[PDB]
Design brief:
The structure holds two protein chains of two kinds. By secondary structure, chain A is α/β, with parallel strands linked by helices. Chain A contains five helices and seven strands; from the N terminus they run αβααβαβββαββ. Chain A has helices spanning 7-17, 38-42, 46-49, 64-73, 143-151; strands at residues 23-26, 53-59, 77-85, 105-113, 129-130, 157-160, 171-174. Chain A is globular, with a radius of gyration of 16 Å. In chain B, 19% of the residues lie in helices and 25% in strands. An eight-stranded mixed sheet of chain B has the order 1-8-7-2-3-5-4-6. The chains are: A alpha/beta, B alpha/beta. At the A-B interface, α4, β3 and β5 of A face β4 of B. Chain B: One of its GO terms (biological process) is mRNA modification. Chain B: GO terms for molecular function: methyltransferase activity.
């Protein structure tokens, strides 16, 4: 999304709410699958988009360390990780496309920036682990947004790189093929 | 709505312990001399002992894999510590921790595995998100085994999947890593030379080199 301008997003958002986004989740296209070079995703002003909030970034096991660098690069400090284990019709079964391990799981990093002490950001009632089975391709389980909602019950949310697979209440998304 | 299968391999279906028992005060010592090359290593890091001041680059052959442990908090700093030490991250296995107190809680029961037998009846009452109660804005209820690669007895790569489920220590004073991880090691690697550093007297393993200090 080098072509895209986030300036349009900032001017509308601040005037419209006076508040920058509380939470931000992304599923970056990694170089097909959106054909994105690692740098380009890595260099967008996500710092600009939200001032005092968490971020959520889904990292593939192959690409896990990289994104840690990435969120930490944007002025975040790593705090928590949410791991989802795929449930087939019964049990914990998952795809075997793991070179040394079968990968039956996905991990979503949580990054923290700014002051989150104040009242809206309620604490310590969350699932580190989600059990829901893989949904129609390609999608994240419904418990996440229900989880995020507990964290920031009445706040602005921003999703990035969202095919309008799950357009959501109070959620704003910028995507390629939406 | 899943149960039992998850808990089978994790617990209740190698007993004896004994190809070296290196003993030392590791702070004084250096590890280069001890026998190598080793094509795999396993550090029980639940204790969180500083590993940066560890020399592992020399001992490992050009090609090797490293298994490391963080029970909860230190997910990101292990990665730098290894990068500094020369290893590139490859995979994750999460030990997902189910509390024993929560399992034996309902319907009312006390002892222990007793709960293990009852997964048949138990399974009906509660869902995997309900027994995940555990003893940072989350109660992290996991431990993560971290895997690295250093260079360019069942072989197959998709042999053991990343997750496992266990029921938490009955006794607080337990500092062990489940014997099943060794099987993951030994299945994943058919190479004879493997190593465990910071081993107990209990944990020496056949055809493994255990290096430990006293207490």
């Amino acid at each position: 999304v080098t072509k895209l301008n986030f300036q349009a997003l900032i001017d509308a958002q601040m005037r419209h709410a006076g508040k920058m986004f509380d939470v931000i989740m992304m599923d970056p296209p990694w170089q097909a699958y959106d054909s994105l070079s690692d740098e380009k995703i890595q260099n967008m002003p996500i710092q600009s988009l939200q001032q005092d909030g968490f971020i959520f970034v889904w990292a593939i096991n192959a690409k896990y360390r990289v994104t840690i660098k990435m969120i930490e690069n944007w002025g975040y400090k790593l705090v928590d990780e949410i791991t989802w284990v795929k449930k087939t019709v019964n049990g914990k079964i998952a795809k075997g496309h793991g070179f040394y391990l079968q990968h039956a799981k996905e991990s979503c990093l949580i990054g923290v920036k700014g002051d989150v002490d104040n009242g809206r950001f309620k604490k310590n009632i969350a699932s580190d682990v989600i059990f829901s089975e893989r949904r129609g391709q390609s999608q994240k389980p419904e418990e996440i947004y229900q989880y995020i909602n507990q964290l920031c019950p009445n706040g602005n949310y921003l999703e990035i790189f969202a095919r309008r697979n799950n357009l959501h209440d109070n959620w704003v998304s910028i995507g390629n093929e939406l | 709505d899943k149960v039992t299968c998850d808990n089978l391999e994790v617990l209740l279906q190698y007993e004896t312990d004994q190809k070296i028992v290196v003993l030392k005060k590791i702070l004084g010592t250096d590890l280069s001399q001890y026998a190598k090359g080793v094509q795999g290593i396993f550090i029980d890091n639940l204790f969180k002992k500083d590993l940066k001041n560890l020399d592992i680059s020399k001992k490992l052959i050009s090609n090797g894999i490293l298994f490391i442990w963080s029970d909860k908090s230190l997910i990101n700093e292990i990665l730098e510590t290894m990068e500094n030490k020369g290893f590139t991250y490859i995979e994750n296995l999460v030990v997902v921790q189910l509390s024993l107190e929560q399992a034996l809680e309902e319907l009312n029961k006390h002892m222990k595995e007793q709960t293990e037998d009852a997964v048949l009846d138990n399974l009906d009452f509660l869902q995997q998100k309900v027994q995940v109660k555990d003893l940072k804005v989350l109660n992290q209820s996991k431990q993560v085994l971290i895997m690295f690669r250093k260079f360019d007895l069942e072989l197959r790569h998709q042999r053991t999947p990343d997750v496992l489920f266990d029921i938490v220590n009955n006794g607080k004073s337990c500092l062990k890593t489940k014997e099943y991880i060794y099987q993951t090691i030994e299945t994943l690697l058919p190479k004879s030379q493997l190593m465990e550093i910071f081993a107990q007297k209990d944990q020496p393993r056949k055809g493994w080199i255990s290096v430990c200090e006293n207490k």
